[PDB]
Amino acid sequence: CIYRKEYVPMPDHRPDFVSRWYSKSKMEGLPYKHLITHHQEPSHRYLIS
């Protein structure tokens, strides 16, 4: 029947959910600590007037 044979129901396939997650985080990119933090200074390292 052509049409029936082609559009058989065929379960077992479930759509992906996490490739979008990977691409979101790739577009996010590296955080502040790996962007500009120098000499691994902590929060209170330079806060004096």
């Binding site: 082609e6 559009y7 129901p9 065929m10 396939h13 759509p15 490739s19 979008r20 990977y22 691409s23």
Partner: protein, 433 residues
Amino acid sequence: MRECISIHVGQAGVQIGNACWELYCLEHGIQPDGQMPDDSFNTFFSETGAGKHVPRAVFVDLEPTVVDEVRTGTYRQLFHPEQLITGKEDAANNYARGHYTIGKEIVDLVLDRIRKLADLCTGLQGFLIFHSFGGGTGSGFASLLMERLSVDYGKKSKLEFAIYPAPQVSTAVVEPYNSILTTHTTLEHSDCAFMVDNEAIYDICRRNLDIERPTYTNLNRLIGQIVSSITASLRFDGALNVDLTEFQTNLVPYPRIHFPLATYAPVISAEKAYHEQLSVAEITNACFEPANQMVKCDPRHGKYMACCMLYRGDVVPKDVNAAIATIKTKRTIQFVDWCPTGFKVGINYQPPTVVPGGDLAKVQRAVCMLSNTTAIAEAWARLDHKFDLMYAKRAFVHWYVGEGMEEGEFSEAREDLAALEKDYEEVGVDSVE
């Protein structure tokens, strides 16, 4: 919320509808009974109280058989039986039948159904109409419905996905007559077109996909991939989402020239793609090689006027920018003088989900091009050629005359497309002295 409505007409309309809506259901995870076991879920499948969903399409035809196939098919229980519309007698490759006598009995019913479907929707974005110029129903009935739809909704966007007759092969003799006759409606009542010929897909499948004996179903899956990748920006979340309004804006510079060419990459099977590394430059130049056009015309015989460029998947703006730069540093790709900037970049993240049992392999990154270029004009020139050499002895005119439309309107449409090709040449003219 954003919503599309699909207006499929004819045997071609209903079969591309089968393939496209199947891909939509399989991507979103909809079971064939209409149930579920990060966006959209309202543009295409509106949801009822019991968790069921109902597609936003109408399939119309003047013969029952192909729609009765769906009514008995796999997804018989998914589509609302009101939406699928049929008639006893078809148009039989005649625009006159499809437009003047048998179209009227049903056009009110079709418009009532689409008015209801609009009242379901809250914010309607636009209409996508799928048909062929060569079919009597898909030509005449679609022309009437577009004519009445434009005056029912003045502002709503109307896109065309049409099967243009191929330059050499076709399945009808009076097909140039029907193609000629549909153009006045598709000129004065449309916004954008995607005329695609079947021969180009035949060659591209025999070339890249290694299927020497394809099917119309294999054609249909690729066209479904085209439309899904186009609507994917509304269907999902993205860095650079594009709307139908956006790419109408960068596909129509002038209101009478709304005829792009569609192209897709990468088109490749599992064994073939097991080796060749797929990247942004490769797909972006494969989309530029004239062997990949879905329209039988050579862009090297024209100049690009505008390019709408939709990426999808693990794409990065850096490599899109680099790919655009590499394709811009090229002389073989020409541009009209008045377009210094030429590209729309849209980006979506969902990697293309494969229909199992089809032909395409599982691909992580994909690209579609909608190129407004002037090289489509020679196709209409050849259509004009065959129309003249069949109109000269008044061949096949008696069918139309006896149905009841006047003969001189044929010459009217001939003059219309003569003027249209004249505008295309005028646009191709450049003011460099």
